[PDB]
Amino acid sequence: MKDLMSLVIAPIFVGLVLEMISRVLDEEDDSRK
């Protein structure tokens, strides 16, 4: 049963992806070595 299984992976998905690109929107420099 996925009563909640399909409710945990579902959101975390769109939330992890949308973030991946959200960083690119302002991912210029990471750190100066």
mmCIF file of N, CA, C and O in Angstrom:
data_model
loop_
_atom_site.group_PDB
_atom_site.id
_atom_site.type_symbol
_atom_site.label_atom_id
_atom_site.label_comp_id
_atom_site.label_asym_id
_atom_site.label_seq_id
_atom_site.Cartn_x
_atom_site.Cartn_y
_atom_site.Cartn_z
ATOM 1 N N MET A 1 0.839 -1.227 0.000
ATOM 2 C CA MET A 1 0.000 0.000 0.000
ATOM 3 C C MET A 1 0.862 1.259 0.000
ATOM 4 O O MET A 1 1.905 1.309 0.650
ATOM 5 N N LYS A 2 0.417 2.273 -0.734
ATOM 6 C CA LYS A 2 1.147 3.535 -0.819
ATOM 7 C C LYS A 2 0.395 4.662 -0.141
ATOM 8 O O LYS A 2 0.717 5.830 -0.353
ATOM 9 N N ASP A 3 -0.612 4.317 0.661
ATOM 10 C CA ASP A 3 -1.418 5.316 1.358
ATOM 11 C C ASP A 3 -0.640 6.615 1.525
ATOM 12 O O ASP A 3 -1.124 7.693 1.178
ATOM 13 N N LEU A 4 0.580 6.497 2.039
ATOM 14 C CA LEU A 4 1.440 7.657 2.228
ATOM 15 C C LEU A 4 2.719 7.565 1.398
ATOM 16 O O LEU A 4 3.377 8.578 1.155
ATOM 17 N N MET A 5 3.079 6.358 0.971
ATOM 18 C CA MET A 5 4.290 6.168 0.178
ATOM 19 C C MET A 5 4.280 7.048 -1.067
ATOM 20 O O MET A 5 5.288 7.665 -1.410
ATOM 21 N N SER A 6 3.134 7.111 -1.736
ATOM 22 C CA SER A 6 2.999 7.929 -2.936
ATOM 23 C C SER A 6 2.800 9.401 -2.574
ATOM 24 O O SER A 6 2.715 10.258 -3.454
ATOM 25 N N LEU A 7 2.723 9.688 -1.276
ATOM 26 C CA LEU A 7 2.531 11.052 -0.803
ATOM 27 C C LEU A 7 3.846 11.663 -0.325
ATOM 28 O O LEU A 7 3.963 12.883 -0.215
ATOM 29 N N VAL A 8 4.834 10.818 -0.035
ATOM 30 C CA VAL A 8 6.128 11.307 0.430
ATOM 31 C C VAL A 8 7.089 11.539 -0.735
ATOM 32 O O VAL A 8 7.749 12.575 -0.807
ATOM 33 N N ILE A 9 7.166 10.568 -1.640
ATOM 34 C CA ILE A 9 8.049 10.658 -2.798
ATOM 35 C C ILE A 9 7.512 11.642 -3.837
ATOM 36 O O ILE A 9 8.280 12.270 -4.566
ATOM 37 N N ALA A 10 6.192 11.766 -3.903
ATOM 38 C CA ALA A 10 5.552 12.666 -4.857
ATOM 39 C C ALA A 10 6.027 14.109 -4.676
ATOM 40 O O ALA A 10 6.607 14.696 -5.589
ATOM 41 N N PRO A 11 5.779 14.704 -3.495
ATOM 42 C CA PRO A 11 6.176 16.088 -3.207
ATOM 43 C C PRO A 11 7.689 16.289 -3.249
ATOM 44 O O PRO A 11 8.184 17.186 -3.931
ATOM 45 N N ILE A 12 8.419 15.454 -2.515
ATOM 46 C CA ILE A 12 9.877 15.550 -2.469
ATOM 47 C C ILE A 12 10.478 15.606 -3.867
ATOM 48 O O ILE A 12 11.550 16.174 -4.071
ATOM 49 N N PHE A 13 9.777 15.020 -4.825
ATOM 50 C CA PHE A 13 10.238 15.010 -6.208
ATOM 51 C C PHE A 13 10.229 16.421 -6.780
ATOM 52 O O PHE A 13 11.281 17.018 -7.001
ATOM 53 N N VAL A 14 9.031 16.952 -7.008
ATOM 54 C CA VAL A 14 8.882 18.298 -7.548
ATOM 55 C C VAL A 14 9.613 19.325 -6.689
ATOM 56 O O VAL A 14 9.965 20.404 -7.163
ATOM 57 N N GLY A 15 9.838 18.987 -5.422
ATOM 58 C CA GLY A 15 10.525 19.895 -4.523
ATOM 59 C C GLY A 15 12.033 19.828 -4.667
ATOM 60 O O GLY A 15 12.730 20.812 -4.420
ATOM 61 N N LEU A 16 12.538 18.665 -5.066
ATOM 62 C CA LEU A 16 13.975 18.478 -5.241
ATOM 63 C C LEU A 16 14.419 18.926 -6.630
ATOM 64 O O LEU A 16 15.550 19.377 -6.814
ATOM 65 N N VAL A 17 13.521 18.807 -7.603
ATOM 66 C CA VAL A 17 13.828 19.211 -8.972
ATOM 67 C C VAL A 17 13.759 20.721 -9.103
ATOM 68 O O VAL A 17 14.728 21.372 -9.495
ATOM 69 N N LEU A 18 12.597 21.271 -8.772
ATOM 70 C CA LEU A 18 12.379 22.706 -8.849
ATOM 71 C C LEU A 18 13.516 23.466 -8.172
ATOM 72 O O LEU A 18 13.831 24.595 -8.544
ATOM 73 N N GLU A 19 14.129 22.831 -7.177
ATOM 74 C CA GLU A 19 15.236 23.437 -6.448
ATOM 75 C C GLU A 19 16.521 23.359 -7.264
ATOM 76 O O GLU A 19 17.302 24.309 -7.310
ATOM 77 N N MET A 20 16.732 22.213 -7.908
ATOM 78 C CA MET A 20 17.913 21.993 -8.727
ATOM 79 C C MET A 20 18.117 23.121 -9.731
ATOM 80 O O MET A 20 19.242 23.560 -9.968
ATOM 81 N N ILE A 21 17.022 23.583 -10.321
ATOM 82 C CA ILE A 21 17.081 24.655 -11.301
ATOM 83 C C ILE A 21 17.088 26.012 -10.613
ATOM 84 O O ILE A 21 17.697 26.963 -11.103
ATOM 85 N N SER A 22 16.409 26.099 -9.479
ATOM 86 C CA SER A 22 16.342 27.345 -8.730
ATOM 87 C C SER A 22 17.739 27.833 -8.362
ATOM 88 O O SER A 22 17.978 29.036 -8.252
ATOM 89 N N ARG A 23 18.662 26.894 -8.185
ATOM 90 C CA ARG A 23 20.035 27.234 -7.843
ATOM 91 C C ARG A 23 20.755 27.789 -9.065
ATOM 92 O O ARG A 23 21.466 28.790 -8.979
ATOM 93 N N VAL A 24 20.548 27.142 -10.206
ATOM 94 C CA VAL A 24 21.161 27.580 -11.456
ATOM 95 C C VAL A 24 20.802 29.029 -11.735
ATOM 96 O O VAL A 24 21.579 29.775 -12.330
ATOM 97 N N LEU A 25 19.614 29.417 -11.293
ATOM 98 C CA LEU A 25 19.136 30.776 -11.480
ATOM 99 C C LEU A 25 20.039 31.784 -10.785
ATOM 100 O O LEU A 25 19.988 32.978 -11.079
ATOM 101 N N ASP A 26 20.854 31.308 -9.853
ATOM 102 C CA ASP A 26 21.743 32.191 -9.123
ATOM 103 C C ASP A 26 22.982 31.456 -8.621
ATOM 104 O O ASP A 26 23.547 31.808 -7.585
ATOM 105 N N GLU A 27 23.402 30.435 -9.362
ATOM 106 C CA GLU A 27 24.576 29.654 -8.990
ATOM 107 C C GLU A 27 25.802 30.111 -9.778
ATOM 108 O O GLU A 27 26.285 29.402 -10.661
ATOM 109 N N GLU A 28 26.299 31.299 -9.450
ATOM 110 C CA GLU A 28 27.467 31.852 -10.127
ATOM 111 C C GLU A 28 28.751 31.220 -9.598
ATOM 112 O O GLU A 28 29.362 30.384 -10.262
ATOM 113 N N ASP A 29 29.155 31.627 -8.398
ATOM 114 C CA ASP A 29 30.366 31.101 -7.780
ATOM 115 C C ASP A 29 30.033 30.293 -6.530
ATOM 116 O O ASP A 29 29.105 30.627 -5.792
ATOM 117 N N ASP A 30 30.795 29.229 -6.299
ATOM 118 C CA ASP A 30 30.581 28.373 -5.138
ATOM 119 C C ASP A 30 31.485 28.788 -3.982
ATOM 120 O O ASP A 30 31.024 28.978 -2.857
ATOM 121 N N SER A 31 32.776 28.926 -4.267
ATOM 122 C CA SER A 31 33.746 29.319 -3.251
ATOM 123 C C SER A 31 35.135 29.482 -3.859
ATOM 124 O O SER A 31 35.498 28.778 -4.801
ATOM 125 N N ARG A 32 35.908 30.417 -3.316
ATOM 126 C CA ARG A 32 37.257 30.674 -3.805
ATOM 127 C C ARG A 32 38.282 29.854 -3.029
ATOM 128 O O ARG A 32 38.444 30.027 -1.821
ATOM 129 N N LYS A 33 38.971 28.960 -3.730
ATOM 130 C CA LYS A 33 39.981 28.112 -3.107
ATOM 131 C C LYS A 33 41.331 28.822 -3.054
ATOM 132 O O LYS A 33 41.912 29.067 -4.133
#
